[PDB]
Amino acid sequence: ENTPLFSPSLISPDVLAVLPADYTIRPLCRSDYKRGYLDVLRVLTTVGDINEEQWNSRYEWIRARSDEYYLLVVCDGEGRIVGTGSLVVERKFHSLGMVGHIEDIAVEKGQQGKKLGLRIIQALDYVAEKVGCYKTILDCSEANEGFYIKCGFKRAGLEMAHYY
Amino acid sequence: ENTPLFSPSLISPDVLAVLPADYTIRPLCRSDYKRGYLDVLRVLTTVGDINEEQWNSRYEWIRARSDEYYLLVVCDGEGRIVGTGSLVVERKFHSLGMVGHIEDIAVEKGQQGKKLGLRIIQALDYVAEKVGCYKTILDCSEANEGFYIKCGFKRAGLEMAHYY
Numbered sequence: 152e153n154t155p156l157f158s159p160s161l162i163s164p165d166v167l168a169v170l171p172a173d174y175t176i177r178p179l180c181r182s183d184y185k186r187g188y189l190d191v192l193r194v195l196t197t198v199g200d201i202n203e204e205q206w207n208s209r210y211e212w213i214r215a216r217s218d219e220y221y222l223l224v225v226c227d228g229e230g231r232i233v234g235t236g237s238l239v240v241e242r243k244f245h246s247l248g249m250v251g252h253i254e255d256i257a258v259e260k261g262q263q264g265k266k267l268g269l270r271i272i273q274a275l276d277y278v279a280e281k282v283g284c285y286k287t288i289l290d291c292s293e294a295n296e297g298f299y300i301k302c303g304f305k306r307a308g309l310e311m312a313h314y315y
Numbered sequence: 316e317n318t319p320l321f322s323p324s325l326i327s328p329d330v331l332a333v334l335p336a337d338y339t340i341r342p343l344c345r346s347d348y349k350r351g352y353l354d355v356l357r358v359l360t361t362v363g364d365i366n367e368e369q370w371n372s373r374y375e376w377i378r379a380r381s382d383e384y385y386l387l388v389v390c391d392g393e394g395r396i397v398g399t400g401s402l403v404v405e406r407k408f409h410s411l412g413m414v415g416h417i418e419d420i421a422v423e424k425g426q427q428g429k430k431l432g433l434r435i436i437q438a439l440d441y442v443a444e445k446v447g448c449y450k451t452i453l454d455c456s457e458a459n460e461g462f463y464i465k466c467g468f469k470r471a472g473l474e475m476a477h478y479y
């Protein structure tokens with residue numbers, strides 16, 4: 152239940168080197184249910200009650216796709232998840248090339264503005280580079296553009312949406 | 316080898332109703348190697364030589380992920396693929412919700428400006444709706460924004476990119 156979602160060898164040594172004392176960034180593991188992962192997600196959207204059975208099934212589902220869905224967490228060294236982010240690696244049918252997609256970055260409100268979001272993005276960029284992505288992309292609002300600029304991203308196009 | 320990538324029941328009846336005579340939109344199948352699929356892709360990027368062995372292996376790879384990677388084609392009714400597009404369905408770890416991502420839309424140059432790109436997008440939107448996506452998103456350049464506006468998309472944010 153402490154078996155990481157993906158290899159810890161995919162975590163940037165340079166990011167680990169600059170985290171606050173006792174903090175770590177690491178792959179999700181199944182035991183993170185107990186470390187307040189869903190609480191960090193509540194920064195992003197309303198989540199809902201989820202029980203350990205459901206968590207365990209959703210964890211086996213993502214683990215079946217661990218060559219695509221890279222979920223990592225920032226742990227405060229006291230058993231509390233305080234940040235998360237996702238890299239989804241799109242393996243094309245670019246001479247069969249690969250694009251990383253950054254998704255669902257969240258930092259607990261009380262821990263915001265301490266570079267933990269930057270560290271999460273640096274870590275997801277390092278995963279994507281390591282697995283052979285030529286680029287990482289993400290969609291953002293006009294309001295958090297300046298966050299992604301500080302993380303070394305540049306405007307590349309427009310996000311278009313269609314609602315049902 | 317005529318076994319479709321995904322169920323033909325996911326193809327919009329309304330789109331099939333308005334295609335030019337003898338044209339169809341349908342899931343990719345393994346035999347599409349022989350119908351000039353790679354030629355349509357050359358509208359998007361430079362592809363390279365790929366042999367039938369490689370095609371067959373890449374086809375089994377996508378078929379293993381046919382709950383995520385929905386590739387469809389426009390067939391002219393004379394054995395020629397003249398358009399393609401992809402829907403990638405992102406199943407979240409939104410109360411475990413789903414986002415469609417439209418990718419790699421291409422229409423052969425000689426068949427452009429006849430509504431085949433619109434039909435491809437309408438068809439991919441219908442797949443996403445049917446499988447339970449709350450929204451479909453895509454990234455585009457400023458130059459083809461007006462194409463997506465005509466297909467019923469609206470600007471929703473910015474695409475940011477990070478190169479290696």
Ligand SMILES: CC(=O)SCCNC(=O)CCNC(=O)[C@H](O)C(C)(C)COP(=O)(O)OP(=O)(O)OC[C@H]1O[C@@H](n2cnc3c(N)ncnc32)[C@H](O)[C@@H]1OP(=O)(O)O
Binds near residue numbers: 266269270294
């Ligand atoms: C692709 C997606 O994930 S979109 C969803 C993004 N997530 C959310 O909107 C959820 C709510 N917000 C958050 O969780 C956080 O505020 C995040 C993840 C956006 C940013 O994380 P934080 O830990 O707060 O930011 P962090 O301190 O790492 O920011 C790095 C730098 O960007 C700055 N910054 C942070 N947010 C913003 C912003 N919205 N606009 C401009 N600058 C910003 C920080 O002040 C810091 O600047 P510095 O280098 O000059 O110190």
Ligand SMILES: CC(=O)SCCNC(=O)CCNC(=O)[C@H](O)C(C)(C)COP(=O)(O)OP(=O)(O)OC[C@H]1O[C@@H](n2cnc3c(N)ncnc32)[C@H](O)[C@@H]1OP(=O)(O)O
Binds near residue numbers: 419428
């Ligand atoms: C998310 C992604 O896939 S990004 C990659 C997009 N693909 C490419 O750039 C590859 C090259 N381009 C193409 O293959 C095609 O031109 C496509 C797929 C962009 C559009 O396909 P087409 O079949 O040419 O367009 P289609 O005739 O369906 O266009 C529908 C309407 O939009 C119009 N239109 C098409 N392209 C554009 C454009 N770039 N700007 C504004 N309007 C456009 C058409 O004239 C038509 O207008 P109407 O309803 O008034 O007749």
Ligand SMILES: Clc1ccccc1-c1nnc[nH]1
Binds near residue numbers: 219240252383416418
């Ligand atoms: Cl294409 C895409 C775009 C944005 C977010 C995720 C995806 C994806 N899901 N599986 C593979 N790729």
